[PDB]
Amino acid sequence: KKKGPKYDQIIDAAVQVIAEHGYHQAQVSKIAKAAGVADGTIYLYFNNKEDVLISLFQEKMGRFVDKIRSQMNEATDVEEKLKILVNMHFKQLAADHKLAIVTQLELTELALKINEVLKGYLNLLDELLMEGKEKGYFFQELDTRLARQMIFGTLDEVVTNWVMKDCKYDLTALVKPVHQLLLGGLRHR
Amino acid sequence: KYDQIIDAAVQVIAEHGYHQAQVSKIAKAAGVADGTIYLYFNNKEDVLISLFQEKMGRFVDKIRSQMNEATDVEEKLKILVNMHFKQLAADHKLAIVTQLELRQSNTELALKINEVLKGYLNLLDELLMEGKEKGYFFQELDTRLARQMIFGTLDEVVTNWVMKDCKYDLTALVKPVHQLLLGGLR
Numbered sequence: 001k002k003k004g005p006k007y008d009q010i011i012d013a014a015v016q017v018i019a020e021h022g023y024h025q026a027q028v029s030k031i032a033k034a035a036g037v038a039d040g041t042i043y044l045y046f047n048n049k050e051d052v053l054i055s056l057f058q059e060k061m062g063r064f065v066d067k068i069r070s071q072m073n074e075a076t077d078v079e080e081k082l083k084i085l086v087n088m089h090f091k092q093l094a095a096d097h098k099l100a101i102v103t104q105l106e107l108t109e110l111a112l113k114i115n116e117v118l119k120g121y122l123n124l125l126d127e128l129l130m131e132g133k134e135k136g137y138f139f140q141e142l143d144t145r146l147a148r149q150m151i152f153g154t155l156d157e158v159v160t161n162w163v164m165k166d167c168k169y170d171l172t173a174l175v176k177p178v179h180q181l182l183l184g185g186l187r188h189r
Numbered sequence: 190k191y192d193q194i195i196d197a198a199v200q201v202i203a204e205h206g207y208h209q210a211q212v213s214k215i216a217k218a219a220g221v222a223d224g225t226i227y228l229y230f231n232n233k234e235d236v237l238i239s240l241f242q243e244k245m246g247r248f249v250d251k252i253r254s255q256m257n258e259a260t261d262v263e264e265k266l267k268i269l270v271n272m273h274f275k276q277l278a279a280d281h282k283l284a285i286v287t288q289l290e291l292r293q294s295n296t297e298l299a300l301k302i303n304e305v306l307k308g309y310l311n312l313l314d315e316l317l318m319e320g321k322e323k324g325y326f327f328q329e330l331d332t333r334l335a336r337q338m339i340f341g342t343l344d345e346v347v348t349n350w351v352m353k354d355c356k357y358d359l360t361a362l363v364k365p366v367h368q369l370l371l372g373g374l375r
């Protein structure tokens with residue numbers, strides 16, 4: 001279903017208030033003022049703060065994935081697809097520091113829901129891994145589930161450390177060695 | 190009664206969550222007066238930190254002693270993966286604490302937890318430097334990135350197991366996790 005115009009507006013403002021103040025100390029009224037709307041307008045779109053948070057994540061992630069998926073199918077080799085995934089992951093977060101703060105630090109039943117949204121990205125990883133196995137790029141005895149956990153767990157840990165250091169350094173400088181490290185492990189490159 | 194308070198803290202935090210976990214709840218579960226809790230800890234945060242610090246310290250110490258007995262750097266890595274999974278597989282409530290409850294939004298609590306975690310990350314750093322110097326790992330290996338890969342991967346595997354109600358055997362994953370980290374995807 002297509003969004004109301006203010007929908008996108010509240011979410012954007014939600015990112016800013018949550019990052020700047022923290023999730024617990026964020027309030028619907030402060031999100032309203034930041035989005036430039038009346039408090040009651042927010043409740044037309046969302047029921048409460050946690051509904052804003054999950055809609056935020058669902059929305060941001062849905063586009064995050066489709067953009068990665070797009071950059072991927074206009075490519076040849078599957079290791080360049082992996083490179084594309086790794087660079088699209090870092091770039092999108094590098095392009096939005098406040099969003100990175102929300103997804104890495106400010107993100108119970110809540111956790112379960114966040115995990116469900118994440119499944120879309122994990123599915124994309126699975127597709128990539130299945131393809132690479134099938135075409136003999138990745139070794140064939142590779143467990144797709146474990147490989148997905150290694151890839152996601154590594155990218156997420158790199159990003160989270162960057163957010164902990166106040167997004168100070170160039171995250172996209174890590175694209176190539178992360179990519180290489182995923183492909184060759186500790187032993188090879 | 191220090192160890193009893195620690196064990197009780199795990200139980201309570203795992204059952205109720207760090208937020209609704211009250212110190213008087215911990216005292217009861219440990220079988221001591223509320224007052225005795227404050228001979229060791231001065232608040233609920235200090236209980237959580239000292240809990241992590243006590244578990245982690247023990248964990249890291251036992252890994253170090255088992256490694257210093259190993260003959261092989263890849264064996265040392267396997268020992269670390271094995272101990273990481275074995276300790277949590279033996280104590281699901283401790284897993285709930287390390288995987289879910291130690292995960293803070295709060296800046297300053299998260300900061301002090303991370304400080305404790307650094308004892309483990311430093312151990313991974315040492316092992317990685319050793320492996321490079323002895324030629325197990327390639328000489329241009331980025332130590333910090335490799336540390337984040339190993340830790341990020343282990344933590345993700347444990348979290349997915351915790352999220353699936355610990356229903357499969359986490360220790361069965363030691364060997365394939367070990368092989369994957371050493372050889373990568375290709």
Ligand SMILES: [Mg+2]
Pocket residue numbers: 153156157341344345
């Ligand atoms: Mg992680």
